[PDB]
Every structure is written in structure tokens, then in C-alpha cells.
Design a protein around this nucleic acid. Sequence first.
RNA 1: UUCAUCUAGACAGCCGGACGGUGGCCAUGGAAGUCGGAAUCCGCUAAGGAGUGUGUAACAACUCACCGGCCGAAUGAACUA
RNA 2: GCAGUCAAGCGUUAUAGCGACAUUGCUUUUUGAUUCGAUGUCGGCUCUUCCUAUCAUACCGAAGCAGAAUUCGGUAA
Lengths: 70, 158, 172, 65, 299, 72, 234
Amino acid sequence: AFGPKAQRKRPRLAASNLEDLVKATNEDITKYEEKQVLDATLGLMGNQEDKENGWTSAAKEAIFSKGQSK
Amino acid sequence: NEVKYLYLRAVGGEVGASAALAPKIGPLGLSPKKVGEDIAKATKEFKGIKVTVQLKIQNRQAAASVVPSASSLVITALKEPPRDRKKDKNVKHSGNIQLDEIIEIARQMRDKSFGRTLASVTKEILGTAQSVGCRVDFKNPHDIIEGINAGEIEIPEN
Amino acid sequence: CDTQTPMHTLKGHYNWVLCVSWSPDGEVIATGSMDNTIRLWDPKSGQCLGDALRGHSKWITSLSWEPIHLVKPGSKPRLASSSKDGTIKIWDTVSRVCQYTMSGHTNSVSCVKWGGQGLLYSGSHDRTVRVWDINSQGRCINILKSHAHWVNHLSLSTDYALRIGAFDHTGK
Amino acid sequence: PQNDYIERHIKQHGKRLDHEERKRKREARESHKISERAQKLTGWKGKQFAKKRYAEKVSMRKKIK
Amino acid sequence: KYTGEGFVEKFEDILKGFPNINDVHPFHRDLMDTLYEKNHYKISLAAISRAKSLVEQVARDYVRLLKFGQSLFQCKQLKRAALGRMATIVKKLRDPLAYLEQVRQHIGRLPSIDPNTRTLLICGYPNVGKSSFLRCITKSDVDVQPYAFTTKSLYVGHFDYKYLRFQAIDTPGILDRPTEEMNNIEMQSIYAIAHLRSCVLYFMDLSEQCGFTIEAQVKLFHSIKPLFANKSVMVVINKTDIIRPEDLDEERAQLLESVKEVPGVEIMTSSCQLEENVMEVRNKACEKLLASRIENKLK
Amino acid sequence: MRVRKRQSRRTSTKLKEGIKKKASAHRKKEKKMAKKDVTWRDPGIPSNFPYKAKILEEIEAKKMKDLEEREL
Amino acid sequence: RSKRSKLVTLAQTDKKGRENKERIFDEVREALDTYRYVWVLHLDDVRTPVLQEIRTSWAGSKLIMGKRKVLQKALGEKREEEYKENLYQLSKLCSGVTGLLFTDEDVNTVKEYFKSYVRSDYSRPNTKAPLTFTIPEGIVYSRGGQIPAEEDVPMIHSLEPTMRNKFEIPTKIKAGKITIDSPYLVCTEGEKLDVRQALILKQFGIAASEFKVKVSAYYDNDSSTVESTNINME
RNA sequence: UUCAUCUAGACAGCCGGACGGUGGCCAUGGAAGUCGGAAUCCGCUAAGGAGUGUGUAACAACUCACCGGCCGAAUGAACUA
RNA sequence: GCAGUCAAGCGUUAUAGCGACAUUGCUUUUUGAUUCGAUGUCGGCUCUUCCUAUCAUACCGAAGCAGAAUUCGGUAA
Ligand SMILES: Nc1nc2c(ncn2[C@@H]2O[C@H](COP(=O)(O)OP(=O)(O)O)[C@@H](O)[C@H]2O)c(=O)[nH]1
Ligand SMILES: [Mg+2]
Ligand SMILES: [Mg+2]
């Protein structure tokens, strides 16, 4: 599959034609843009921006884990 | 003027087979289109079979010719159908070639052969046929060689 | 099968007899072996017809017969053979020679079936099915590529009729 | 840098001027080094060295056969 | 417990470091699929994950058993059994680990391409002057040679035009073949052209010293025409120091007009020995890209 | 240049006597395995001995003499 | 212990034993009876295409090579051990790389062929220089100035360590090309050549020296005499 | 201790040869002994693999398998203590 | 671990019996998904020293080791 002794030189499942290739890639890009917008609604507004200013949420208190001992 | 000689491998009958000769053409100031056209015009006899092509340059000209080779002659005498690389791949050369055709190839190859006998040239051509994987007289080429060496097969020209 | 007793023993081959096939006119038995040979037999006398057909470098995997309805009258059907070397060889049994060796496949050919519209369908371990035309000097017409692994078998709709030839459930 | 930049660098600039000689002398010193390791390594490292030497010799004999 | 934790920490360092092929930008997904065979990629990483789970299970089971050991001999046998089972699990990972080590070494050296910045894509037949033009306009060190496919991977260069950073992409050459017989080397260029919104510069050689005829180059352009839709397109006729479009033959001139006829492409000439002309063609391509991007963002 | 601890080679009485018992047990076990086990049960003249030819000639003449000694 | 450990190679060819020496011995002693004239030829530093061309041009005759001591033992080293009368003189006339030509043609024809046969060859060490060669200043090319650099292709970079160490030529790699700061004179004409200079000339492909067979003498079967030929012995 | 090589030349070294059909067939953008898959033959030999590795984008060049020239008397391999 | 396969040796004139190195099956399957009975002694504080089986610091070696950073290894308490 890969490396010094690899024998794969062609894709396993080639696109039928360039029109199919460009249409599938455009749909993939649109799905990626929508997915990244959806995760930017929450995660970038939250966790990611905390590292930029160096803010960290405080430690979880050990009392909330009662009822879970061996 | 001095004469310059080049040797290359090209598929016969196909134009645009001189793309590998662009580094050669560069310093020589030649025309790639005309070089390829001359190669195709020379290799019209050999259809879909790789052949050794000689290019001669004197003054400002371009001559193309086909150098005889053992494997190419065996594949041509096999009389296989023409093939296009979009259609046929992994092709096997497993036809039948008669001994008279093998001897004719040996005649075409005797001029630049180091064998002292047409039998020796015939055995070399039979080894090449064994390499290409085709059958001779509906028999294995090495077995034909063994019969020749025993003497049950006689080479006519002595 | 009438008395449930042996009638003939056929001992021409040198290795395992991998495949047997009966002619669709019911005249000759073809056996393809592990020693890359195909041998034809007269069943009435239990005899070997001449010498073995040779040309395969690997063991015979499947045999097929030319359909009777395609075979012109006064002539015998041809025999198609496949092997691990990836080739399909066509044999004329009347003159006992090999006419074509189709060679497109890259791995072991699993099976070959001779259809009723002058075509041969070949399945190999290279995940492909090849459609060849016998009328066009044994050239590959089509390559069907939809399997993600070895093709093990194939079957045609008309396979029962092609194997039976002109005979029936009454066997006239 | 991008792609096979060390290979391109060797192609465009070569190696250090003592590369071949230094590598050759290291390979020549290997026999002495292997003997010194076999006699000087101690404990777990020595036991592992002897084990690996036996496996390599078996592998070489199988390849010759 | 300590041996189990060591194996788990190695496996976790493997799993966290490697990219998530289905979550990256689709350009990178396609490029890594071409380079490393996505199926094998995900199967190897999943094999690592399965080994991690099995090692955790073995450690937990044998600690629980060791709670009931009655002597040194039995306890030692249980510990040896646990470590031997861990070793068996790890030995079953031999092939995926070697594959992943090759993948890590190759993927660490890939050029960093931003799919959402300003890009000049350079494409065409082999030996038409793509790498030479990239060398002329950037400081990238792509090798320039008179043989086909000197460039076997995407190369990136950078420049500044009107206080903005632009990136340029040199691609391996494209042969005029269907996608079914197209190989991975050409798939790199095809995916680059399909994904990167850019100014695509199609290079043409009229001296045919690339080994291809003018008719073949026009055929390649009209064949890859579906690829650059909603992307700015320019045709650069390189090697004008040998032959110029002015002194072509009549049919070849009609072919050049045929290339021009497709909207809204524009034809410009260049020589890699003409610094003024290479800078002018770069500036025109950048102007087209900036006008397109600004007209896009203004809406 | 920090020198480590060296193992004492002074004899220990307890270890010496324990090794005595160990060796007796080992010998008894080996003898038992020898009486139990089922495993199936003349280099000639050295190549460097100078009078090899004389030794061989004498052994052949002895064989010829012994061939007729028993018969008559 | 402490001995040199021999290198082990896994190749497809084994060595020849005493049986091959015996086979060549038998062939010599049979050809002595079969043919009439036995010629002693000196063929040092001969190339195999040239030797095979010689064998082809003398079709119907025999050319036998092999170990010189084997050939001399087959012809007979001394007078009481010679295969034919007064053959020991021909046997002791052998020297160096020796070939034996068993033939039936005329003395004049054999002399004329071996006087007229000459081919271009690489210049050997301890031979006179056939020309004066200099690597030109700048980028070093494959032919090194014999053909114009525009036709010539630059020397591949992998030969730079060989040129620097083995040939002792001051070279530097600039942009993957071998370059010399100044022109480098390799040999002056009419100067005895050593191994290094011969290797440099062979590397650049200069073949200005001439090759020619030396003919020592021949022996006649029925005349049983040896005649010194003294061909190309200057 | 047992095998082998050896003044019709031991081992080590240096030098020279190391060829021809032939760039053998399939495959590759390219692949010429040396990314791969199957055959691995024939000739000329003193000998020379459809090639032991370095190397090239492919060639080249080098190498070693094998053979010869110089040198001149012992040498090598596997086992045991 | 159990069951097997190979075969350098051991063994022997009866291809029996041992048997290193390698290797396969189960455990454990493919797309990186998603707490289960220690039956009997434990821990702090103050303070000292020792081992090296080295975490950091010193010096080295190897790695697609560009740089930066890291990994594996050697000497070293
Ligand atoms: N005369 C001329 N030759 C050029 C020019 N650009 C490139 N070349 C030559 O074309 C050959 C291939 O150029 P290259 O940059 O590798 O083109 P690429 O294969 O498309 O990347 C090189 O040998 C150059 O010498 C040019 O502008 N004029
Ligand atoms: Mg390029
Ligand atoms: Mg330590």
C-alpha cells in the first residue's frame, strides 16, 4: 500500500469523469463548511478561545464524584 | 560533416513516441514533430510491437530506420492481433511459430551474430522465443533445442 | 448408475483431476487436471482420444463447451479451459489444436462460461469479469469492475440449456 | 523544507568530505566492536546480546541453506 | 499495572498525534487518501486502538486474579501470564506499526497548504515550464530538469503583491488520459485543481520541446475544462524566446483562438528568461484572483 | 571513578551444606531418569599417524589369515 | 581465535576445479594432432568483443586460452615430456596472456591477417601517452572537452567522490554539478602512465591507443620445426 | 579431530577481463541485471548470473560471482577439549 | 498456557525417542468506534544515610535528526 516496496500506482476506485469529481468535491466542501460553522457555534466560542487568553476552567470538585468508589 | 547515431525503443505505428527524445533534440536543434513522423513512417511495418529505432543525423537531416531484434522478430512472426493499450493489458505471447519462421529470423539475425553456425543462431533465437513464452512447433523451445542438439533436427544451411 | 457399479477407469493424467465436463451432445468427456493438461475421452469404450492438450502453465480450474445451437451441423463443439495462470484457452477437438489464448487477466481465473450469444465470460482473482467475443478473434470486449475481492463463481441464465444442448428430460 | 529535502540536498551539495572513509572505517571496526561488546557487556544487556547473536547466526545459516 | 500503563501511553501517543482523515479539510483528505490509501490508514489506526483496549483488559483481569494468589510461585506465574499476553497482543501489531512509521515520516515533510488563502495554481503538460516559473516568482527550491515528471509532489512557494501574502502551487504534469487510467501522481494535480479556489495558470509550449504537440496541449486544456469552474483561469504560453504565437502556422493559430474563445480565459506569453514578463503575468493573475475574491466577499 | 561493592567470596557454611544436599538430590534424580528413559544406545587410524599404511597392511593380512584359521 | 572472517556471497556461479584444467589439456593435445600449424599469440589486456571477433574471423580454426602453465604442460615442458618432436621450443616461447591458434592456412595468410589487424583501445598503465588531455575550466562534462559541451551532458554528481578521492582531482559540487576551479592536465603526450591517469582516461572515454596481437612463433606438424615470427614485438 | 585447495601454482593483495542474442517477456510517466510479477534460455568462452550490492528520473560508471597476469609455499572450513 | 508445525543439533542401522531458534490457532477484529469477595496489620511527623534498576542537570551515540522540539540508547548517584 505504501513505502519503499509499494506497488499501488493507481486509485482503487477512480472517479467516473471530471464532472463527477468536481461535483463530489463541491458537495464535500459545502458539507465541511456547514459542519465547521456548526461546531464554531459552540466549541470555538467556548473551549478554543480559553487557551488564547490562558483561562482554564477550575478543577472538578471531588465531591461530585461520590457514589462512584470501588 | 559528421554523422550522429541515436538508438531508442518505440511502439510501432504510434505518433508522439519521440517525447523521450526531447533531451536529445534540445542540443541538436531538431524538430520533434518531424522526428516522430519519421519514426512512425519507419515503424509502419510493426504494429503495436516495441522495436529498436535508429536515428541518423547528417548536416541538417533526419533519417529513421528499424534495427532487427530477436524478441521483436519473434513477436512479429507470432502474428498476434493488433492491440491498443486502453483495451489490452497483461497480454501473453503464447502462440505457435514454425521452425521455418524461426530459421528465417535466425537468417535476419545472422549478420550481427557471434555464432559460428546457423544452428547456434537458431538455438539463440529459440532461447529468445522461450523468454517471450511462445511455443515452437507446438513444442517447448528448450525441447526443440534439445532435439537439435541430439541431431533429430537438422539445420539446412551448412 | 443402473446397477450402481463402475464401468470405466480413465488413467491418462499424472496429477489430481480437478474438473470433468461432458459434451453437450453427449459424445466426449473432457478432464482438466492439476498437471495443467486437458484430456478427452470416448465414454462408450473408455478410451483416450489421441494425446493431451497442452499450453497451460498452471492447473486447470474450469471447463466450458461451445453451445450446440451455435455449433454448425456436421462439426463438433470447441472446448474452453481456464487455469491459475490467468488465461482462457480455446481448443478445436476435431483437429486437436489451440485456436485462441485470451490473456487479459492478471491473477488466477476462477471460471469461464460460454454464453449463447457468441461470448465468453471469465472470472478471475483480479476482482474483474471479462467479456470476450469469439467472433472477433478472441478479443476482450468488456471489463466489469464492481467486486472488492476475488470473484469465486458466475452463472448465466441459460446455463442449464447450454449444458443440456439438444437433449431433454426425456433424453431423446 | 518540503518533500524529500535531504535527498535533494545531497544531490545538490553532496555529503561531508570524509563520509565514505569514515563509514568504511566504522564498518571495518565493527568486528572488533562486536567482540568487545560480547566480552564487556554485563548482566541483562550481556544476556540479551548473546541471545540476539544466537538468533542472527541461526538466521544466517537458514539463508545459506 | 505498570507494564499495562506503559503500553497504553505509547498507543495513546500514536492515536492522538496522527490526523483524523475524515475531519480534516476535504483537500487534505483527498491528498492523504492519494498518498497513503485511506482504507489502510484507518485500519492501521483502528488496530492500534483495539490493541490499547485489549492491553487494558488483560491488566485488569490479572490484577483481579492476583488478589487471590496464595504463594510466590502462583503470583509470579500470573504476572508472567499477563505480560506474555500483552507481548502477544503487541507482536500482532507488526505490520501496522511499520506502515504507520513510514506514514509519519512522509507526512511530516508535506508542504503546508492553506486551502482558503490566495493561490496561484500552475498546471499543464510535463516540461512546459511550471517549475521554472515557480522558481522565477518564488524562492522555492523545486528542481528544473529536461525530462518528464521531475516533480512528483506538490511544491509551494510564496510572494507578496500589494501587501498581501500569496501562495503558488507547482503541480506534477498531467497526461491526457481518462480518470480510470490516471495514476496517483496526476491525482495530486487533479485534486489540487479541483479543490483550491485560485487562479489556475495553464502553461503551453509552442516549440513542442516538451515532447507534446500543440494539438495535444489544446486537447488537454479542453479536457480539464470542467475542473476550473468558478475559478479564475489564465493561459501562459511559455518558451517565447524560441517560438512566439505570432509566427505560428494558420491551423495552430486557429487552435490558439479556440483556446481563447472559452470564457473568460485570457492568453499571455512568457519567457523564464524575461523577468519583466514573468512578473507581469504574475501580477495579472493576482489582479484576477483579488477581483474575484473581493467581488465574492462584497455580495 | 566511583568503585562499587564487590561480592564476598568467603564460604558460607549454610550455603555449602545446602549445595551438598542439592547435589545428592540431583544425582539421585539423574540415576532414576537414567533407569527410566527410553533412548537408543571405533574412530580408527588418525589421519596424521605416519605408519597408516603399515597398520592397514597388517590388519588386512590379519583378516586374510583369520579367514582360513577358523575354517582349517 | 582472532582471525579474519571471510566474506560470504550468495551468487549463482561456482568456481572451476582441476577438471576444467584437464579438459583444456585434453583439447590442446587433440588439436595438436588435428591441425597443422600451432601459433603462439600474446593477447594481454584484450577486450572480449575483440577476442570474439578474432575467433569469428578465424572460423574453422581453433583458438585456445587458459593458464600458461597448463598450456605449456599440454605442449610438453621438457624434451622427454613433449607431445611432438621439437615442440618444447614453442612451449617455452609462451609468455603472459597466451593463446594458441591451431590452423591449416598458409603462413603468409596468418602473418598478413595478424599484421593488418588493429583496433582502438584504452591506454594501459606503463604505456606511452597517445595524446595530451586536460579537463577544461568550469563545469566538468561527461567527455571532458573532447566533444562540444553543448552536445555533451554534464557529469553525474555520484562520480564526484570517486573523482575527488580515487583520481585525486580537486572538484566541488555546485548545484549538483561537478566543477573545477582551474583546468586540470591529466597526462602529457609521450609520458609513462600510471594507474590513476589510466583510470581517468578510461572514465572520460578516451581511446587513442591501438591494440594489436603479438605473434611469437609457430610450429609445423610435419616439418617438426619452430620458426620465430617476431610480429609487432617493437 | 575430520574434511577440502595446492609448483599442469596455497591463501592475501594489485592489475586485466567480466562478453553476444539483449534495453529477454509482462507491467510503469519513467524501470536498460539491480521498484515489482513470472520465465530464467541460447551462443562464445579462460570465465562471465536474463545478475551480488553501490548508483541514475531512466541510461552511464563502479562493484562481485567467475576467469587470467604478477607474486611464490603452505592455506582454508566445520567440530572437540 | 494448552495444541500443533518446522528443524540446527542429541540419538541410531530399528526414517523410534528427545529437541534450541523460528512459527500457527484460541484468547482478540478490521475503518481509530466506545468498578465483581485482597480475612489480616496500615499510615503520618522529625531526621540521616545508602543503592542505581537515571526523572532532571553534564557529556556522548542513533534516527527523514532542516531549524525548533521530541524519541531510543551509552557513561554517570
Ligand atoms: N528556451 C527555454 N527553455 C525553457 C524555459 N523554461 C524551461 N525551459 C527548459 O525546459 C526544460 C523543462 O522545464 P521545467 O521547469 O522542468 O518544466 P516542467 O516539467 O513543466 O516543470 C528545462 O530543461 C528548461 O531548460 C524557457 O522559458 N525558455
Ligand atoms: Mg517540474
Ligand atoms: Mg547504569
